[PDB]
Design an enzyme around this catalytic site. Structure first.
Site, PDB file in Angstrom:
ATOM      1  N   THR A   1     -73.720 -46.685 127.450  1.00 50.54           N
ATOM      2  CA  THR A   1     -72.879 -46.249 126.856  1.00 50.54           C
ATOM      3  C   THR A   1     -72.901 -44.747 127.070  1.00 50.54           C
ATOM      4  O   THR A   1     -71.962 -43.741 127.416  1.00 50.54           O
ATOM      5  CB  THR A   1     -72.450 -46.664 125.403  1.00 50.54           C
ATOM      6  OG1 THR A   1     -72.413 -47.887 125.390  1.00 50.54           O
ATOM      7  CG2 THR A   1     -71.522 -45.846 124.956  1.00 50.54           C
TER       8      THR A   1
ATOM      9  N   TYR B   1     -76.163 -56.443 123.361  1.00 47.75           N
ATOM     10  CA  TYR B   1     -75.706 -55.039 122.740  1.00 47.75           C
ATOM     11  C   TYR B   1     -74.662 -55.310 121.836  1.00 47.75           C
ATOM     12  O   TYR B   1     -73.296 -55.539 122.339  1.00 47.75           O
ATOM     13  CB  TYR B   1     -75.459 -53.906 123.845  1.00 47.75           C
ATOM     14  CG  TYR B   1     -75.187 -52.653 123.549  1.00 47.75           C
ATOM     15  CD1 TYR B   1     -75.042 -52.263 122.319  1.00 47.75           C
ATOM     16  CD2 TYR B   1     -74.711 -51.661 124.570  1.00 47.75           C
ATOM     17  CE1 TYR B   1     -74.605 -50.824 122.012  1.00 47.75           C
ATOM     18  CE2 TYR B   1     -74.187 -50.435 124.269  1.00 47.75           C
ATOM     19  CZ  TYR B   1     -74.384 -50.025 122.964  1.00 47.75           C
ATOM     20  OH  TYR B   1     -73.818 -48.681 122.525  1.00 47.75           O
TER      21      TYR B   1
ATOM     22  N   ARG C   1     -66.607 -49.884 119.403  1.00 51.18           N
ATOM     23  CA  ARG C   1     -66.224 -49.708 120.941  1.00 51.18           C
ATOM     24  C   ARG C   1     -65.736 -50.925 121.480  1.00 51.18           C
ATOM     25  O   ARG C   1     -64.744 -50.717 122.518  1.00 51.18           O
ATOM     26  CB  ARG C   1     -67.537 -49.218 121.753  1.00 51.18           C
ATOM     27  CG  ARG C   1     -67.787 -47.866 121.169  1.00 51.18           C
ATOM     28  CD  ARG C   1     -68.937 -47.189 122.172  1.00 51.18           C
ATOM     29  NE  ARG C   1     -69.206 -45.856 121.906  1.00 51.18           N
ATOM     30  CZ  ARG C   1     -68.715 -44.795 122.583  1.00 51.18           C
ATOM     31  NH1 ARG C   1     -67.820 -45.084 123.460  1.00 51.18           N
ATOM     32  NH2 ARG C   1     -68.938 -43.571 122.360  1.00 51.18           N
TER      33      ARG C   1
END
Ligand SMILES: [Mg+2]
Ligand SMILES: [Mg+2]
Ligand SMILES: [Mg+2]
Lengths: 296, 297
Positions: free
Chosen positions: A45, A135, A140
């Site tokens: 990211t 993850y 997000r």
């Protein structure tokens, strides 16, 4: 289970004239290696994975793999997607280029169910023979890997060995390690690095470590040695920079900080990411002055 | 001025048969939409599993939509968005070339651009084509929100940007939008609150329910635009149960389940990470469907 733990850096991707600045990328990886970092996360990211081409994705992974040969430092390659077919490909792709493991973000936007998340990661894990770290960043992706799903995947898939948690939910971190204490819980949230580590977390994948790798490296290893008074004391000093590095969306502040420290030549992003506001530029500059920033 | 695409619009599901796009079912479904009063079709949107379709399948579905809607009043508002601006520009130019009348361009997901970034993102998209561009705000999916000020600035600064599809469950924001920029085309992206948005000045819907009940969504929208608010609200109230049950799991999992249960598609196939619903939601969807008359082909 094969694991990749310790102090890890979600590498920024420097741009120069709109192309990936490949020599600064390698130079930054040498700065992480020389400051106690145990593994680097290319094209995560923080690395603006969404705006990199497949060739640049490959380029950054191979620069990371090449630069870490002969060191203890691992390459935990970002290789996730909201399309399972694509995620399997990126997983096989990262393995074929020498990555030691893959960090695989939960599918964003299309928000799969828990059953879908299970099949998604089961397909990824069965496609490679290198460690796979889940993850979870619901702010997000719009979805959450539940504690039950993480534990089932950890128990059902041999290479799935833990999770990056970026959810500000210490309750969930107790839930995970109390019901499955063999998993590697990794902090994806710098401000609460110490609380996660002190509950049994085994590493961090850090944004702050881009700027202050020695402090993040010392924090994690103090904690792993159960020197919690020194780990908490580094965590307490880092709170101000840890927060200001998110005054705008990551990696906008960290790239701003790296540029202010003279570690990268251009404050370049790829749209829709952009330079911070003139205020936030100033706020980042002010907070940086209270920290010793290592050079090259 | 401004070129606009409004009215009752359908976010088309993308049927799969043996892992491939059932192009032949796709055309039949679009012709069912036309035949039930729909004003425009949205290929490869969120409901169309855009994230798991290849760029070639992207083309194929847009092309089928453009071809199937030729000689009718129905327009093609193609999904053409990305969280990478370079990609969104390409998809926008790409959709224009295949006959799309306009593009629906979702807000960048996952990477959370700032309001400044969102402006530059959409300004680049709008300047790359000369067809209408409809913004798409769904913060529960993207992790970011196009603020009212950003929407209004974009509407006023770029000639192709003419409105926004709102999927945010925030009727306050829809009043905020139309009170400060009443020339904008606010489009409902949330079937359950279709009528409240339309009765405040919204000019259309991009519907998930319309896949299953195109006649009802079409009548609702046209009643409201003709200011017959008692009949529009009466369809909205009847549709509430199906409108909600179509989101008991993540869209488009329930709507495809319903379309399969209605015999409108051959296979209950998704592309991972999407999957068939839980066994209980399968039964719940089937039960709620029972109270609606589902038009055939
Ligand atoms: Mg060496
Ligand atoms: Mg020691
Ligand atoms: Mg100092």
């Amino acid at each position: 289970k094969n694991i990749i733990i310790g102090a890890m850096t979600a590498l920024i991707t420097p741009f120069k004239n709109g192309k990936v600045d490949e020599q600064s990328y390698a130079r930054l990886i040498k700065r992480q290696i020389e400051n106690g970092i145990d593994a680097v996360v290319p094209v995560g990211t923080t690395g603006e994975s969404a705006t990199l081409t497949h060739e640049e994705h490959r380029t950054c992974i191979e620069i990371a793999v090449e630069t870490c040969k002969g060191t203890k430092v691992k390459v935990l390659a970002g290789a996730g997607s909201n399309a399972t077919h694509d995620a399997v490909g990126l997983a096989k792709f990262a393995k074929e280029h020498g990555a030691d493991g893959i960090l695989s973000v939960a599918p964003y936007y299309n928000k799969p169910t828990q059953q879908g998340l299970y099949e998604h990661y089961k397909a990824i894990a069965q496609s490679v023979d290198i460690p796979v770290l889940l993850y979870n960043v619901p702010g997000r992706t719009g979805c959450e890997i539940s504690t039950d799903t993480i534990i089932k995947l950890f128990r059902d898939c041999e290479n799935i060995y833990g999770v990056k948690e970026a959810s500000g939910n210490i309750d969930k971190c107790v839930d995970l390690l109390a019901h499955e204490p063999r998993m590697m819980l990794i902090s994806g949230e710098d401000a609460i690095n110490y609380p996660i580590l002190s509950n049994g977390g085994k590493g961090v994948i850090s944004v702050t470590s881009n700027l202050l790798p020695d402090m993040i490296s010392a924090l994690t290893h103090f904690a792993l040695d159960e020197n919690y008074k020194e780990a908490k004391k580094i965590n307490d000093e880092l709170y101000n920079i840890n927060k200001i590095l998110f005054c705008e969306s990551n990696p906008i502040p960290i790239k701003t900080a790296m540029y202010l420290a003279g570690l990268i030549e251009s404050l370049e992003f790829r749209l829709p990411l952009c330079s911070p506001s003139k205020e936030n530029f100033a706020k980042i500059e002010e907070v940086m002055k209270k920290y010793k920033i290592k050079g090259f």
